[PDB]
Subunit: 338 residues, 2 copies
Amino acid sequence: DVTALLERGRTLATPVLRAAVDRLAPPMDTVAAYHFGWIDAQGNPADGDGGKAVRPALAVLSAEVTGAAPEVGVPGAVAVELVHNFSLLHDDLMDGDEQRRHRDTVWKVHGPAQAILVGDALFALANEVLLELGTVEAGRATRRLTKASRSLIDGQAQDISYEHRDRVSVEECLEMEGNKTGALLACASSIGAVLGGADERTADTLEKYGYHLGLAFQAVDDLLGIWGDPDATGKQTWSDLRQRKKSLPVVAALAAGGAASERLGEILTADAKASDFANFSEEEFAARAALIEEAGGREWTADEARRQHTIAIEALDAVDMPDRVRDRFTALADFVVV
Amino acid sequence: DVTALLERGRTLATPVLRAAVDRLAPPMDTVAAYHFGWIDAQGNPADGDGGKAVRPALAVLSAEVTGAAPEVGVPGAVAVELVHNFSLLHDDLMDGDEQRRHRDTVWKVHGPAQAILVGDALFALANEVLLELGTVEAGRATRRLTKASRSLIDGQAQDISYEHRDRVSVEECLEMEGNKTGALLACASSIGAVLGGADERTADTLEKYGYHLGLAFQAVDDLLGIWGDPDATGKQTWSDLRQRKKSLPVVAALAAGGAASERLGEILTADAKASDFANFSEEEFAARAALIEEAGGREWTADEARRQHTIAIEALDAVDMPDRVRDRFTALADFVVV
C-alpha cells in the first residue's frame, strides 16, 4: 500500500498541474514543459520526468483527515508542486547549476530571463489554483502556502549567506534544512485538511508532523548524497562531496572536534581554493567521507533522522483522525527513511 | 487636494512597507533597502528615493468607497507596492537594465542571484501582508492581487516574446500595456474596497476604472518617453527612442501606412542591427520622433489617452459610492494626464 499512495498522489495531481501549465501564455507554457520533462531542448516530446510523489500523496491524505474525498486536497497538491518547481527554477539559476536529473536546466537551454519568468509564473499560478475556489478554506490554505514559500526563500537566503563560509554550525544547517525541505512538507501535510475544513489547531499539528518528517527526509537525503550507491541514486559516487555541500554529516563532523574533525576542517577549507578540484578522484572523495564517518558525522545524522521520524509520528498521535488515515501517514514516514 | 491625496497614500503606506522589509532575513533586508533607495551601494544611508504615489493613494481611496477608514486599505497599498517592486527587480534583470532612476539596479550591485531572491521575497511578503488578516475580505483581496500579478508576468512574457520583432501590432501593444500597467492599477483601485467588505460586482467595476486609468497613464507615459522635456522628466531627450521601445506612438506610426510610416519601418529595422547605434545623436532621435508624428503616432496616442480616461471615469458612474470619494477618484484620473 506504500507505493499505492505515491501512485494515488501522482495520478491525481499530474494531469491537473499539466493542464494548468499548458494554459500559460507563450513561451511560458513550452519552457515550463521543458522544465517538467514533457518536451526536450528543441521542443519535441520526451520522457524520464516523473520523480518522487511524496508531497502530492501527502496532500490528498491530508484531506482524508477531516473525512473529505482525496480530490478535495488536489488543489493543495498542485499548488505545493508548483511552488516546489518555482523554487527549483530560481534556485538552479541562483546556484549556477547547469544540470538537474542529468538534463540541462531551463536557464542553460532557454536563458536566465525565461527561468526567472516561468518561475514567477508558477508561483503566481499556485496561489491562483487555491484562491480560484473562492472559499474561506482556500484563503486559509493559501496562508499556509505563503508561510512555506517565505520559508523556502529564507532557506535559499541562508544558502547564499553561507556559500563562502569555511564552516557552518549544526544549528545553522538544521534551520536551513527546515526551511528548505521541512516547510513545504509541513504545508503538504496540512493543506488538504485545511481545504476539508479543519480548525487552526488540527492543521498546525499536521504541520508539525510534516516539518519533522521533512527534517528526517533531508537527513536521509544527506546520508544518501554521500554514501549512496549509484545503482539506487542515479548520481555519481560521493555526489554531494563533489559539489561541496555542507550537509548535515559534513557539518556534524566539523562541529565534533578531535583529530578527524580538525583534519577535515583543514581539507575542506583547502578544497574551496583548490586549483585542481576538477581533477579530484573517487578515492579523494572517499577519504573525506571516511573522515566524516570517523568524526561521528554519519552516525549523528542517522540518529537525527531517527529522532525526527519519532517527533513526526508522535505529533500524529496528538490529532483526532480516522485510524486508517493515521496508518497511511505513519507508513509514508517509514518510507522516508531507507 | 490633488497632491494631498498622493501625500496621504505615501505617508500611510511607506512606514508599514519599510517595517515589513526590514524584517526580511539577511541579506534580503539590506538588498531590498538598496532597491528602495534607503541605503547606497556600500550600505550607508541615502535619499532621492520617493517616486510617485498613485497606487497607494488609490488603494486607501478604494477603502473609503464602502465607508471604511483609509487605514483599512493600507494592507492593500503595501501589497500592491511590494508586487510592483518584485516586478521591477526581476524585469530589470531580465531586460539587462543596469540603471533605474539614475541609480544602479540591484543585480548590478549585489548580483543576479540576490535580485531574484529579494524579488521572490517581496512577492511572497505581499501575499502575507494580506492573508495575515485571516478574514474573508483578505482572501478575496489576495485573489485580486494574484490576477494582477499573473497579468504583469504575462506582460513581461509578451515583452520578451516581441523583443526581436521588427514590428508589433497596435493590438499587441495595447494588451501588453494593459498587462504591464493596467492590471496593477485595476488592483490598486479595487483592493481597499474588497478589504472594506464590497461585493464582487462593486469591485470589478472599480477594477474597470483602474485598468482603463492604467492604459491612459501608460499612453501619457509613452508620449512623455519621447517628447518629454528633461526638466520635467529627469530623463534624456527622446529617452524611449534611445532604448528602442515599441511604445504606442512608435507602434501606431508603424501600423499607419504612407511614406512616413514606411520610412520609419525601414529605419527602425536598420537601427536594430546598427553597429554605430551607440553613436547616434539627439538629432537622429529627433528625426525618428518627427517621423512618428508625421505618421500620426503622437496624435493617435493622445486620443487613446483621452479615450481611456473617459472609459475609466465613465466606469466610476456605474458604482454606488459616496460623492466625496467619487470626486477624489475623478481628480486622480485628471492628474494621470499631463
